[PDB]
Structure 1
Amino acid sequence: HHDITFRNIRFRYKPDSPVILDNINLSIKQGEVIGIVGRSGSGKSTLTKLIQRFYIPENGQVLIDGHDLALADPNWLRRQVGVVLQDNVLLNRSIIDNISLANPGMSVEKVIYAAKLAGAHDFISELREGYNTIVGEQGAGLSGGQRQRIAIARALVNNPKILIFDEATSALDYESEHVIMRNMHKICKGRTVIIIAHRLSTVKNADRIIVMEKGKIVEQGKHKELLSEPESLYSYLYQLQSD
Structure 2
Amino acid sequence: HHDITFRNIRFRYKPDSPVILDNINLSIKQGEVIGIVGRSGSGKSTLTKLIQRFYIPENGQVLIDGHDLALADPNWLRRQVGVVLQDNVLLNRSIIDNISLANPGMSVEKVIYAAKLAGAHDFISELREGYNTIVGEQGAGLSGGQRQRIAIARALVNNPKILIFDQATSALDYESEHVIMRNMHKICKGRTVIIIAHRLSTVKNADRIIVMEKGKIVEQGKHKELLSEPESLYSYLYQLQSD
Q: Same fold (TM over 0.5)?
A: yes
Q: CA deviation at 1:138?
A: 1.3
Tell me the SS of whatever aligns to 1:98: helix
Matched, 1:192 2:196: no
| 1:16-48 C-alpha deviation (Å, 9 max, x unpaired) | 000000000000000000000000000000000
CA distance in 2, matches of 1:223, 1:189: 21
| 1:56-90 C-alpha deviation (Å, 9 max, x unpaired) | 00000000011000000101100100000001001
Aligned twin of 1:51: 51
| 1:169-216 C-alpha deviation (Å, 9 max, x unpaired) | 000000000000000000000000000000000000000000000000
Stretches (4+) displaced over 3 A: none
Identity of aligned residues (%): 100
| 1:108-163 C-alpha deviation (Å, 9 max, x unpaired) | 00000000000000000000000000001111110000000000000000000000
CA distance in 2, matches of 1:75, 1:91: 26
CA distance in 2, matches of 1:87, 1:145: 10
- With normalisation by structure 1, the TM-score equals 1.00
CA distance in 1, matches of 2:227, 2:46: 26
Paired positions, count: 243
CA distance in 2, matches of 1:153, 1:144: 14
Tell me the SS of whatever aligns to 1:210: strand
- With normalisation by structure 2, the TM-score equals 1.00
Aligned twin of 2:35: 35
In structure 1, stretches of 5+ residues that fail to align are none
What are the equivalent positions in structure 2 for 1:106-125 lying under 5 Å apart? 106-125=106-125
CA distance in 2, matches of 1:64, 1:178: 32
CA distance in 2, matches of 1:175, 1:225: 31
Tell me the SS of whatever aligns to 2:201: helix
CA distance in 2, matches of 1:106, 1:140: 24
CA distance in 1, matches of 2:139, 2:123: 15
CA distance in 2, matches of 1:122, 1:183: 13
Across the aligned residues of Structure 1 and Structure 2, the Cα RMSD in angstroms comes to 0.3
CA distance in 2, matches of 1:154, 1:57: 28
